[PDB]
Amino acid sequence: DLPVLLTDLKIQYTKIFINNEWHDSVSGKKFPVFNPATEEELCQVEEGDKEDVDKAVKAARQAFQIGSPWRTMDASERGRLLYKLADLIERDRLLLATMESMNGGKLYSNAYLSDLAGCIKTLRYCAGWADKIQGRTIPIDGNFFTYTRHEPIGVCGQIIPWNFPLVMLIWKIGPALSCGNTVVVKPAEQTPLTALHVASLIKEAGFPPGVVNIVPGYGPTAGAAISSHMDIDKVAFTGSTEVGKLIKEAAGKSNLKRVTLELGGKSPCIVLADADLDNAVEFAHHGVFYHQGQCCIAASRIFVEESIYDEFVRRSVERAKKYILGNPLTPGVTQGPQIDKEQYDKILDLIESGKKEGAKLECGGGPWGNKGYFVQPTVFSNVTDEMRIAKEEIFGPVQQIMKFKSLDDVIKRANNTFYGLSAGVFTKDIDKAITISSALQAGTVWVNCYGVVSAQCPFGGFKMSGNGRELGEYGFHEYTEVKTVTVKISQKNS
Amino acid sequence: DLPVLLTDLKIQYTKIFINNEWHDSVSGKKFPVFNPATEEELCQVEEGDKEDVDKAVKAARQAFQIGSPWRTMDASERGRLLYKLADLIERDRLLLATMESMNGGKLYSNAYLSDLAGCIKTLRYCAGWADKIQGRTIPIDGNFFTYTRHEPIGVCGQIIPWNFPLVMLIWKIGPALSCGNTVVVKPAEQTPLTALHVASLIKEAGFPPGVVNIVPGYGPTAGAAISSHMDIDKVAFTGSTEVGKLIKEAAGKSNLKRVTLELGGKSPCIVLADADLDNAVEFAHHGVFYHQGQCCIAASRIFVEESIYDEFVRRSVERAKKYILGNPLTPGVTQGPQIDKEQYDKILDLIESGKKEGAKLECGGGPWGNKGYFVQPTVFSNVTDEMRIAKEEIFGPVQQIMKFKSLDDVIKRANNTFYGLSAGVFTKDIDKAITISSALQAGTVWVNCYGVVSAQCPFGGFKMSGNGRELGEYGFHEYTEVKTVTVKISQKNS
Amino acid sequence: DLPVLLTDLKIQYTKIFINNEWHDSVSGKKFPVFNPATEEELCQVEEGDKEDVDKAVKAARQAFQIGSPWRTMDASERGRLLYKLADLIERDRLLLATMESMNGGKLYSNAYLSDLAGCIKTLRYCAGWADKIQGRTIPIDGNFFTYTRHEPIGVCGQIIPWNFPLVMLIWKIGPALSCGNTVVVKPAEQTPLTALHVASLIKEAGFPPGVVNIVPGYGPTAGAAISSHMDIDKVAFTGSTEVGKLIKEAAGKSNLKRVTLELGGKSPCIVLADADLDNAVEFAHHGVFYHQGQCCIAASRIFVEESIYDEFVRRSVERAKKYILGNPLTPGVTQGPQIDKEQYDKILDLIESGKKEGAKLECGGGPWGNKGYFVQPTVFSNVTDEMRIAKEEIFGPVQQIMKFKSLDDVIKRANNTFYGLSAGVFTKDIDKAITISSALQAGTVWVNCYGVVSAQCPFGGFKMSGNGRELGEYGFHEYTEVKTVTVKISQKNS
Amino acid sequence: DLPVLLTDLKIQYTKIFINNEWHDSVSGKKFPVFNPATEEELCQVEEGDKEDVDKAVKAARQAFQIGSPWRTMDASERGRLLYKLADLIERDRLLLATMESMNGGKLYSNAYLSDLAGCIKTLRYCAGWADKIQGRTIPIDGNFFTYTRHEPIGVCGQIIPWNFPLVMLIWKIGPALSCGNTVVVKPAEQTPLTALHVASLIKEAGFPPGVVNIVPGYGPTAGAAISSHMDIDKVAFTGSTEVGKLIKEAAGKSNLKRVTLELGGKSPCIVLADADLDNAVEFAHHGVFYHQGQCCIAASRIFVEESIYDEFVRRSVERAKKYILGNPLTPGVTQGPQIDKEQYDKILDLIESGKKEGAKLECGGGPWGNKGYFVQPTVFSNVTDEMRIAKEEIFGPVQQIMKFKSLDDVIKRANNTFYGLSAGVFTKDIDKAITISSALQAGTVWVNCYGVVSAQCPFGGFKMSGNGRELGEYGFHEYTEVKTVTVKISQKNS
Ligand SMILES: C[C@@H](Sc1nc2c(cnn2C)c(=O)n1-c1ccccc1)c1ccccc1
Ligand SMILES: C[C@@H](Sc1nc2c(cnn2C)c(=O)n1-c1ccccc1)c1ccccc1
Ligand SMILES: [Cl-]
Ligand SMILES: [Cl-]
Ligand SMILES: [Cl-]
Ligand SMILES: [Cl-]
Ligand SMILES: [Yb+3]
Ligand SMILES: [Yb+3]
Ligand SMILES: [Yb+3]
Ligand SMILES: [Yb+3]
Ligand SMILES: [Yb+3]
Ligand SMILES: [Yb+3]
Ligand SMILES: [Yb+3]
Ligand SMILES: [Yb+3]
């Protein structure tokens, strides 16, 4: 079932959230938030800058002090607070899904059934880890008792993207809080609204003040203050590889803060001749077109064995011609707008390069509508490796389909990129499934599927698609700092 | 027993090591290597620069290719090769300890009994992990089989310091090789010799070509080529916090390579009134003066409770006046030289600041001898927190002793530094031992001891003393890259 | 705050629970359930026997079949069902605490504040593990892909004691269900009632039918049917060491089912001269007298250093004379009855042996009241090692206090028992705390405390106090069965 | 290459090994050891009985005492001793392989290339774990510091089978010693000799006295003394399911010692129509006929899809007719004798049942030669599920081949046994490989292979094929005993 909000959405939370209270910006300035489907202003939000980030860090630092409620409470109680927060997001699911759709240009069906479900499920997963984070006792050489503490790191600056505002907010704060950190969150300038509603729920759930602080504002100002801050211990960022480089540089230049990055991709699929063809067509299609192509895992290079290539292209094109564009709140609509002008312009520019560089336009290839940042769903066949559409992350509804005849070569071509977020392998051959997935230089390899993401799995990039992993058991390591304690004793025994 | 080499040391290995063969530098240039005890040139070594680092990376990359001997061999066989290398270092222990002492200005007794023992033991520990590096199978939501591979990362650039050339070489290459990486090692410009001997043993042990490549040369040239290299996947560096910042910046600027850093410290000890006094005096003394103070963990701020402060200072000063300075090869000598002019000048400058800023000079405080970079063992009492000798890493035989009356305050003072490598707590109180060690912002906290390092423990800094951990179970994580493989199935069962 | 049930308790659930429905016994027989405070019959309950256990196993086996809802549901959803069950127990906390107090002779204050809190907390802990149970991927020798599945074992027969009916029900079913097993629970003949209420909540929460089956009845009939059953995969039992031996024998004789046992103890405390005396007196007192002494961890031998022995005995005796005996539902009452006649008779017999064998009776030593199985709180000093009260588990409010002068000897005396459930060490000496706790042959050693139990810790006996551990990360291993899957491939890569 | 011993084998070690010295039996009795290929007596060996087991346990107990060399030595040094033992077995490989072949009736080629290689490799694997056995630090509720120690269990009685004397000796002692236990080993009455040679190497390697004690003798006497012993903490047994039941009973009856069992099987293979046929034929053939069929994993029921059944039977029969029977020391011989008369008689009896119950004899079916316990390699087709040869472990060179048409049904038939050691699945279908292996109730499932065993994998049975696992990370758990230490503190921090 797909239920809907019965009254119109009223925007309430538009301020900076520090020590569980609502703050005007230090400057007093505010910035507009827009609906990408209408190009109309929804509201104004307080514009946080370096001075506001500074207030947030002081609050996070104080909440992190030895003897504070957040440091001293039972790990099980940090878990309890996270599960309570998940219950509250579940209570406000209609409200949050509507706001997410309206602000983010995100199909409401997906916002409600996928984004909100994933947000609730990830929080509950993270809640479960809280009192299961454990160090070791270690049989060191000599007469010593050695143990380790897996402590929280401290204050964690977290910069959230616009493409999955709620999901990414929870992917950041869930593990950080489960491990006992305090956070300073900087939601995307395009999509601050749902994060600020979640802040109200953090207060309601009973988190101690300063444990979660949310400073909306811009990248170059608030994001650059977080990255260069001398008392932020760690920064996590999801976004473009370009900005990831600048984050990593500012961390090294300032206080050597720990850095994790989830960045873009140019993720390949390899479709062997023996693949289940309609399954491969459907998953590759959804793999590239999901959320108007605005996924870092977008399956933006599809390599198909020559003998099934024409049939793959044909089936793919017919699937791509079945969309209904429009406002993402209207039922039956199956493709919303792109997030803003900058992204819209980038996508159209890259579509034009595909045309100019000699790719075969199968469908789409231009804008749509009288308002909103809409781009027609586009398919290119006969794509070659030095084309811009084969090398650059488009972040739009633009599919590239390529042929191959040699498996050795297509693996090289798949790996011949500075990216490495994910990949897809489609085959009925057991040996090929295992050997190809082993050889691909990508963080997640899907076999006979694509875009399957769950809280129980680690997720992140090889190469310039990122540093570190999120979620799973393994992701939690990056929100702890290991302390070794070695105690002199008279005599040890095994 | 302390055995010695029966014939004089002959230097054999002075060339760049790539694909298990000895290479002249591309330029043809060579650089001098000196003995810090005599200031005399021992030999010339080939000067590697960006062009040589480029050759080494290509060799490491080729050895890392899917289907290569190093990728395809049993994990147990990578372990076997490491244990064989440890056996060979054990065979050449006299030779290596002598060379280490001669080149590094390191007391031979310590070089033989500690450095070489630690080198052999760490390698054997690392060898044991090789076929115990494991991913997971994960009960993901939905009908999927999900597993993870903990793969080697790939080509790892490793920059080794001059203070423990052999130990640090093994701390880098042992875990990297155990996990299946290939390496490009850049030993310190001051101490290339023992690394090049180990390279000959890597060949003898039977490691495939290109798995370990060693390029001697300078920091600004060879180190900056490694840090900015577009096909190096990871960089590990031990050294000054200053250079660590530049490494982290160059990694972000170039290819977002993974970075681990073990950097300096200003490590504190807290000595409570109830402490075993002579134990605390002895460990704090060795904690600061070991290897002419040239340890990143140097216990360079010693806080002592007021009532035992005078007695602690008295006992410490008498311990510090018992050294015999001279050539580190002569038996009975108990303090060698500093490594070079740059470090020598820095130490004397900081000693002069202590005098000028009003610290109480208890002993030492000047140079020694007619040749060699010797500094008298120096003790300052009545040190205050804004003195240069309390804030800056000296990296010399210079002890600082401070008084405290409040435990709350001394913990704040201990933590009031951008460093955080290690710390010492001396007390008979169980509760104090546990609570103080928990509250200290340091990677290793010793209780009633100091400088106890073993292969089974993770080791590394909080804050600007580093990123990541070395050794232990936990250290091995940073030499793997996690890949998630998610396979569509018809029906899963628990 | 201590809230109470506003109306009188009405007993509703008195039947056998199979496939989420209420069953009469196959024979049609029923057995009486009593209140140990009044000796009055509360109700009748259906008497399950081998024929009913057989029906329960068939139901558990069917729920465990490949393709069943319980096998195929997301691990996260097994977790969700457990957290929902915890919410329901929390909703019915007053009801359950009252029933537990009334049926079990358990102080209501403790039943509400401790037992019910522990029950809710343990379930929530277990819920968190459900989708965090993971196998491995393993770098086996040769060209193979090897992974492991940590599968549920299957049908688990679980025999629950009368002393903590609710807590022990949850300690059994929580981990078993989290791991994906199905269960056949056999609550104590004395205390079936709270388990049957929880069964109604298992139905309400939405667990699939047959996942949890509860067969009340006697030990020799229903317990012996479970232990000897040919299609029960595992048996877990908490109870006397005597019956544990019979369970282990019947498992070996029948189908080699896996066995875990948590059995009795004769747990020692060692109180050194430097101990915080009133802390040691208070914890040792609570350690032996908690729940009328009916805890397997009862601190039933207290060894005190000679110089503080007289003062320890004095303070202990005055603490023991402060109880108010009576109905465990009346506020202000601080000691309830023993569970039944058999236990009552055993306790009085052992008290008489202490008198006859020459122990010094400090207080108590006889029965109390006109009805209920009440025993005066009793303290013996000058206890020696060959007395019955020093060797045999009393399971009653009977404290034994002994002197020692040698630490070597008292450790030997502490370890000189076939039991080994737990122990207590009281000292201010760091070295003694670590070395004594290492040397004691006991599963849980408390330092400067006693009886501190939490869901995050493994718990179980050394020697004849048990096989296996419950709770913690480690406890979950015993509710999985490891399957290795090794797949031939053409070429492996690291 | 296959090198051979240059002089004839001389038997040296024939005595009981206690405290690293050679002991006559207490009775003075000795028992004969035979060559199964000639039926000739090789030597006499001291017959250990309960009195000798008692001496061994006292020695093991003393070596296990707190403060002993084995308890106090570095974990890394226990590892060193194991790697040294592996080096010594490698030195004596020719000698040991020859003795193993001669005493065990085991093909020399296999004894040298497989058994000895596996023995050396498993020891080296186990050596690596020694200083990697670690407990935890745990964020318990309340103000406590909680850690766990993964201690050795203590004295471990280990009963070794005759089919792989050396491999099984090492599978037992390697993990037990790595974890810090002491052992009392009881090699098979048929094959004591190689174990006693290894005992001499344990002395040479420098293991402390009493750490390894070896008591040769019979099952009903020495094995029953170990199983019922009141001061043996754990028993591990590999052998028949029949004796496993008696071990488990005697453990429960005596001191509740921990029990692990690796018992027989009736392991199935499922060969789907799409399988690589010659690969499936070859692996299934080796799966049943390896070491004269005397493997607990013997692939003794082969289910083949109807359409390829006739061709599978044909190819299997031709493979089975290619053996050369004779003395296992003669090169070119490819099938040795069975171990003794009891096993020989059992095999022939079961072959006769196959004939009488209506199975189709394809080849073999009788004895061979004038001396030695030789049985012709035998193949039965058209085997049905209620035949003795389909239900009972034969432990001989006797292959059973069955047809199936339904996959649902053949899985039920495969699982319809009280055994569950291992299984084989042969298919090219990815989904079938994963789903069938998940559904099979067996400890190891091989996919497109069979009998692939390595030290890095856990190994053991489901159901009546065993309790617990050996080797791998998971196997090491069963040689530790977990102790929780919970320390009261003033205030905890995360
Ligand atoms: C909503 C999903 S995430 C998710 N689902 C997707 C994508 C493309 N197609 N689909 C169906 C995608 O790119 N993400 C995503 C991945 C990483 C970071 C952010 C978003 C989820 C699932 C389980 C738990 C939480 C979130
Ligand atoms: C030689 C030791 S390391 C070692 N031993 C020391 C130090 C100061 N006093 N002492 C006795 C010290 O700073 N290091 C060290 C620590 C980290 C990196 C490099 C060196 C060792 C021990 C065990 C295994 C390997 C190496
Ligand atoms: Cl993982
Ligand atoms: Cl750790
Ligand atoms: Cl544990
Ligand atoms: Cl495992
Ligand atoms: Yb299909
Ligand atoms: Yb427009
Ligand atoms: Yb002392
Ligand atoms: Yb000079
Ligand atoms: Yb006190
Ligand atoms: Yb009575
Ligand atoms: Yb083939
Ligand atoms: Yb014969």
Side-chain angles (χ1 to χ4, degrees), chain A residues 9 34-37 42 94-112 116 165-166 194 291-292 327-330 337 339:
Chain A
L9 188 78
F34 296 96
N35 181 338
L42 290 171
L94 294 170
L95 181 162
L96 282 169
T98 305
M99 190 181 292
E100 192 84 320
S101 175
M102 191 179 308
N103 193 186
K106 187 187 282 280
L107 293 169
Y108 175 73
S109 178
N110 289 344
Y112 183 86
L116 263 292
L166 245 8
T194 55
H291 188 33
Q292 290 87 256
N327 193 302
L329 296 167
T330 311
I339 192 55

Side-chain angles (χ1 to χ4, degrees), chain B residues 122-147:
Chain B
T122 297
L123 256 181
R124 288 172 176 164
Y125 178 81
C126 292
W129 270 116
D131 59 353
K132 293 165 194 75
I133 305 300
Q134 303 175 150
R136 303 292 181 264
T137 61
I138 302 176
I140 188 186
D141 283 356
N143 289 315
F144 307 93
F145 171 37
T146 294
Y147 61 91

Side-chain angles (χ1 to χ4, degrees), chain B residues 169-189:
Chain B
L169 176 64
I170 270 61
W171 279 39
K172 264 50 158 160
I173 73 175
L177 293 173
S178 187
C179 293
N181 298 282
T182 54
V183 305
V184 173
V185 178
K186 186 255 162 254
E189 50 262 58

Side-chain angles (χ1 to χ4, degrees), chain A residues 114-115 117-119 121-122 163-164 167-168 171 238 286-287 290 294-298 450-455 459 470-471:
Chain A
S114 178
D115 292 66
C119 189
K121 282 175 176 256
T122 297
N163 63 337
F164 291 85
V167 168
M168 296 274 84
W171 279 39
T238 298
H286 287 293
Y290 197 78
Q294 298 171 132
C295 301
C296 311
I297 65 166
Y450 204 89
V452 181
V453 172
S454 209
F459 177 93
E470 292 174 300
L471 301 187

Side-chain angles (χ1 to χ4, degrees), chain D residues 133-145:
Chain D
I133 305 300
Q134 303 175 150
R136 303 292 181 264
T137 61
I138 302 176
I140 188 186
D141 283 356
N143 289 315
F144 307 93
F145 171 37

